Design a protein around this motif. Structure first.
Motif, short mmCIF file in Angstrom:
data_model
loop_
_atom_site.label_atom_id
_atom_site.label_comp_id
_atom_site.label_asym_id
_atom_site.label_seq_id
_atom_site.Cartn_x
_atom_site.Cartn_y
_atom_site.Cartn_z
N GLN A 162 -9.71 121.33 3.88
CA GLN A 162 -9.47 120.22 3.88
C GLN A 162 -8.13 119.73 3.05
O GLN A 162 -7.62 118.45 3.46
CB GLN A 162 -11.06 119.77 3.31
CG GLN A 162 -12.19 119.44 4.22
CD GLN A 162 -13.50 119.09 3.33
OE1 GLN A 162 -13.99 118.02 4.03
NE2 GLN A 162 -13.78 120.31 2.83
N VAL A 163 -8.29 120.57 2.07
CA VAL A 163 -6.86 120.09 0.93
C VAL A 163 -5.54 120.03 1.47
O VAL A 163 -4.53 119.00 1.89
CB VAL A 163 -7.02 120.45 -0.35
CG1 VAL A 163 -5.83 120.57 -0.81
CG2 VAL A 163 -7.93 120.12 -0.93
N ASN A 217 -5.55 120.08 5.63
CA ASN A 217 -4.96 118.88 5.95
C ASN A 217 -5.41 117.77 6.15
O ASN A 217 -6.53 116.71 6.28
CB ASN A 217 -6.51 119.42 7.42
CG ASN A 217 -5.94 120.85 7.78
OD1 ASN A 217 -5.52 120.75 9.08
ND2 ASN A 217 -6.63 121.95 7.49
N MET A 218 -4.41 116.95 4.26
CA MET A 218 -4.64 116.15 4.13
C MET A 218 -2.78 115.26 4.85
O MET A 218 -1.66 115.78 4.33
CB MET A 218 -3.75 116.10 2.88
CG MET A 218 -5.68 116.37 1.99
SD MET A 218 -6.71 115.14 2.51
CE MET A 218 -8.42 116.13 1.79
N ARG A 277 -0.81 117.63 -2.25
CA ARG A 277 -1.68 118.81 -1.48
C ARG A 277 -1.26 120.21 -2.68
O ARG A 277 -2.59 120.94 -2.70
CB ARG A 277 -1.43 118.94 -0.14
CG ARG A 277 -0.39 119.03 0.62
CD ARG A 277 -0.61 119.34 1.89
NE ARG A 277 0.35 119.73 3.05
CZ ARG A 277 1.07 119.64 3.80
NH1 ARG A 277 -0.23 119.21 4.83
NH2 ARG A 277 2.01 119.86 4.25
N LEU A 326 -11.36 117.89 -4.50
CA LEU A 326 -11.66 118.20 -2.79
C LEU A 326 -11.67 116.51 -2.52
O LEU A 326 -11.07 115.73 -2.44
CB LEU A 326 -13.13 118.66 -2.17
CG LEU A 326 -13.19 117.95 -0.93
CD1 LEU A 326 -12.10 118.08 0.21
CD2 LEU A 326 -14.46 118.27 -0.26
N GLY A 327 -12.45 115.75 -3.86
CA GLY A 327 -12.69 114.44 -3.75
C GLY A 327 -11.26 113.30 -4.48
O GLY A 327 -11.10 112.77 -3.50
N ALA A 344 -8.35 114.83 -3.81
CA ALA A 344 -7.05 114.88 -3.14
C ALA A 344 -8.04 114.01 -1.84
O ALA A 344 -6.62 113.08 -1.34
CB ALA A 344 -7.40 116.25 -2.26
N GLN A 345 -8.55 114.10 -1.14
CA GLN A 345 -9.21 112.78 -0.45
C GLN A 345 -9.06 111.18 -0.62
O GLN A 345 -8.61 110.75 0.28
CB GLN A 345 -10.70 113.28 0.03
CG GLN A 345 -11.95 112.26 1.14
CD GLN A 345 -10.90 112.41 2.63
OE1 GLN A 345 -10.99 113.08 3.06
NE2 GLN A 345 -9.49 111.13 2.52
N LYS A 346 -9.29 111.42 -1.77
CA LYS A 346 -8.79 110.01 -2.41
C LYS A 346 -7.20 109.06 -3.00
O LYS A 346 -7.19 108.53 -2.07
CB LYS A 346 -9.92 109.63 -3.65
CG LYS A 346 -9.56 108.38 -4.55
CD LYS A 346 -10.28 107.20 -4.56
CE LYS A 346 -9.88 105.71 -4.65
NZ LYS A 346 -8.49 105.27 -4.90
N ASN A 352 -5.41 110.97 -0.25
CA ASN A 352 -4.77 110.71 0.99
C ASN A 352 -5.15 109.73 1.50
O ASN A 352 -4.78 108.92 2.60
CB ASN A 352 -5.78 112.47 1.53
CG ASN A 352 -4.96 111.81 3.27
OD1 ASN A 352 -4.09 112.21 3.60
ND2 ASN A 352 -6.32 111.56 3.55
N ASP A 353 -6.47 108.86 1.21
CA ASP A 353 -6.69 107.64 1.44
C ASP A 353 -6.12 106.77 1.27
O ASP A 353 -5.75 105.67 1.70
CB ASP A 353 -8.49 107.52 0.74
CG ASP A 353 -9.03 105.99 1.50
OD1 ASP A 353 -9.13 105.48 3.12
OD2 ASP A 353 -8.30 105.58 0.27
#
Length: 56
Positions: free
Chosen positions: A13-14, A16-17, A25, A43-44, A46-48, A50-51
């Motif tokens: 996932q990290v 694929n940001m 990343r 992960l949280g 990284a996703q935040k 990315n968002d």
């Protein structure tokens, strides 16, 4: 799935940001490696990030 593939799934996932640039990343990958128990947190974050950096 299969087993505790938390580390693997988080890592994938990290990677694929698409909104993050390499340095960010990669930073999270090193954070994962350093803090394996905290893969969920990494992960949280990284996703935040990315968002927040999404183009729209």
């Amino acid at each position: 799935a299969q087993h505790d593939e938390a580390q693997q799934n988080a890592f994938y996932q990290v990677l694929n940001m698409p909104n993050l640039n390499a340095d960010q990343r990669n930073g999270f990958i090193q954070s994962l490696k350093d803090d394996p128990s905290q893969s969920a947190n990494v992960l949280g974050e990284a996703q935040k990030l990315n968002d927040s950096q999404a183009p729209k």
